[PDB]
Design an enzyme around this catalytic site. Structure first.
Site, PDB file in Angstrom:
ATOM      1  N   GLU A  45      68.115 106.493  30.991  1.00 63.05           N
ATOM      2  CA  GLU A  45      69.492 106.359  30.362  1.00 63.05           C
ATOM      3  C   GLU A  45      70.970 106.724  30.962  1.00 63.05           C
ATOM      4  OE1 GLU A  45      67.251 107.899  28.488  1.00 63.05           O
ATOM      5  OE2 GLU A  45      66.757 105.361  26.809  1.00 63.05           O
TER       6      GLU A  45
HETATM    7  N1  LIG Z   1      64.424 106.946  25.772  1.00 68.33           N
HETATM    8  C1  LIG Z   1      64.485 106.927  24.606  1.00 68.33           C
HETATM    9  C2  LIG Z   1      64.136 104.954  24.464  1.00 68.33           C
HETATM   10  C3  LIG Z   1      64.750 104.697  23.693  1.00 68.33           C
HETATM   11  C4  LIG Z   1      65.041 105.380  22.533  1.00 68.33           C
HETATM   12  C5  LIG Z   1      65.178 104.207  21.221  1.00 68.33           C
HETATM   13  C6  LIG Z   1      66.479 104.468  20.340  1.00 68.33           C
HETATM   14  C7  LIG Z   1      66.634 103.371  18.957  1.00 68.33           C
HETATM   15  C8  LIG Z   1      66.023 102.311  19.269  1.00 68.33           C
HETATM   16  F1  LIG Z   1      66.483 101.527  18.100  1.00 68.33           F
HETATM   17  C9  LIG Z   1      65.087 101.904  20.180  1.00 68.33           C
HETATM   18  C10 LIG Z   1      64.873 102.690  21.160  1.00 68.33           C
HETATM   19  C11 LIG Z   1      65.578 106.347  22.427  1.00 68.33           C
HETATM   20  C12 LIG Z   1      64.880 106.811  23.838  1.00 68.33           C
HETATM   21  C13 LIG Z   1      65.546 108.162  23.374  1.00 68.33           C
HETATM   22  O1  LIG Z   1      65.771 108.961  24.392  1.00 68.33           O
HETATM   23  O2  LIG Z   1      65.863 109.062  21.882  1.00 68.33           O
END
Ligand SMILES: Nc1ccc(-c2ccc(F)cc2)cc1C(=O)O
Ligand SMILES: Nc1ccc(-c2ccc(F)cc2)cc1C(=O)O
Lengths: 278, 278
Positions: A45
């Protein structure tokens, strides 16, 4: 035209933990440009710091290389630690699509070295695909019930009978790709100290270093199934097998039917700092 | 403790082309640390600038997030353009595991805006898996023979009858994963102007922006199969469908049986600059 820092979240040493890129003063960037920047960086991210809209300290937008997220664990922890370098406040209120997240910043001589966050309260249910999942992981059974938790992302928990058994997993990642829109978190341990490994084709990671959004749910899982009590913190060590050891601390207050708070904390450290020409 | 730049290779505008991270003054880094840094950055490649060992200007080591490479196209182009900011030389001789690569740097007012490189001379043969590959790509036939070229990486070329047909490809990436240790390059065009799309599960990219090591082989392929002559340059536009348009220029001198030079050139632009704490 924009400054950024790279924070290794859930680590006190660079090249441990889980990186996130944090871009400051991003109010002049349209969201399409933020998405293009996150793709350019290709970190799990990139986050962008915006002026607050509902009384918080800042609004944070969170992007993977492909899409925007409403909430994420280690990216928000790293953002709070990065921003701590530009404020004196003990507490930091970061607005997100899922609401305003409260952070407590921990400093030594002005440097933020750790932070604690309140997380969205998860929901959960049985996965109902146990045989398929166990086969993909290469094992016959779980210790505790295989349940899937939702707090933004979805996290499944599979328990292993020992830390050695957890380290020995060699999952079939092709077979795991049939588990959409979720991450698979395998854990083992006892008492205060637990180990985790996370695998998620759906979220684009073979094996994750520190799954911050899974730490709260794991504390709930352990309390529900009698390994800890609600109100007791756990130390979760993740990413050992991939050379990115990460320490996450988590606690779930209340009881299963009436959770009042889900707290996750960790160290963070700056890996690098720079400026982009856009 | 180390400065780096992010170069978008095969582009004149930031957020186009293909990024590479270039780390300067890296002689104090053991290779295990270089690999950990490349993993931290998670770009397709990070390169490290070292003192020369065989009379060149610098020795360049090239890392993906997982392993070291002996040669790579856009990473070396971006490295040459990054280093041009720290030298006045018109030509740059960069040592690699595959030998010393000669670059010609193109400047405007001291800024290197483009460079041309001599590439390893490829070898090639028929792939021999045509029906399987065409099925994975979703089409019935290739225009020109399906051949696989080797110049470090391996690149397969599949020809499409029109640019519209190339843009319409929706490959089955699961089925492409059965093609190990190679990239699949689909092309279309005429005369001087060609379009390409590259897909490679083996090299960890769903669709690549600018496959610099494929540009030389494509020029050879087009000359062998009568669409251009040896000694004539082509302009290859890649990455349009993924929003990373990239212009690669390539020329193959000699004849198929006695190639004397394979040249690839492109623009490059700085996306960002920073420093890491290691
Ligand atoms: N590495 C990640 C990749 C995706 C998500 C994610 C968040 C909300 C959603 F609605 C769907 C997926 C979170 C993370 C995290 O690090 O918390
Ligand atoms: N993106 C890439 C990924 C891998 C390789 C590669 C090079 C040598 C070898 F022996 C095997 C693979 C090259 C590139 C490139 O950009 O040229």
């Amino acid at each position: 035209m924009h400054n950024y820092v790279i924070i290794d979240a859930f680590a006190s040493v660079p090249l441990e933990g889980n990186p996130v890129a944090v871009f400051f003063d991003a109010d002049d960037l349209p969201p399409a440009q933020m998405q293009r920047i996150a793709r350019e960086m290709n970190l799990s991210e990139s986050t962008f710091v915006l002026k607050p809209r509902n009384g918080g300290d800042a609004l944070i937008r969170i992007f993977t290389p492909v899409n925007e997220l409403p909430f994420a664990g280690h990216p928000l922890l790293g953002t709070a630690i990065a921003l701590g370098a530009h404020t004196d406040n003990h507490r930091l209120y970061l607005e997100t699509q899922m609401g305003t997240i409260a952070f407590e910043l921990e400093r030594q001589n002005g440097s933020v070295i750790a932070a604690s966050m309140d997380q969205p309260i998860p929901t959960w249910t049985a996965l109902g695909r146990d045989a398929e999942l166990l086969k993909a992981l290469g094992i016959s059974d779980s210790t505790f019930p295989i349940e899937i938790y939702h707090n933004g992302p979805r996290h499944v928990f599979v328990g292993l009978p020992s830390i050695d058994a957890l380290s020995a997993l060699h999952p079939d990642h092709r077979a795991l790709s049939n588990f959409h829109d979720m991450a698979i978190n395998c854990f083992a341990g006892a008492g205060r100290r637990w180990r985790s490994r996370m695998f998620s084709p759906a979220y684009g990671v073979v094996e994750d270093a520190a799954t911050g959004s899974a730490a709260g749910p794991l504390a709930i899982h352990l309390a529900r199934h009698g390994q800890i009590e609600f109100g007791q913190p756990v130390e979760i060590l993740q990413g050992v097998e991939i050379g990115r050891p990460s320490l996450m601390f988590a606690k779930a207050e209340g009881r299963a039917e009436q959770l009042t708070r889900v707290e996750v904390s960790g160290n963070g450290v700056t890996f690098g700092r720079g400026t982009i020409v856009l």
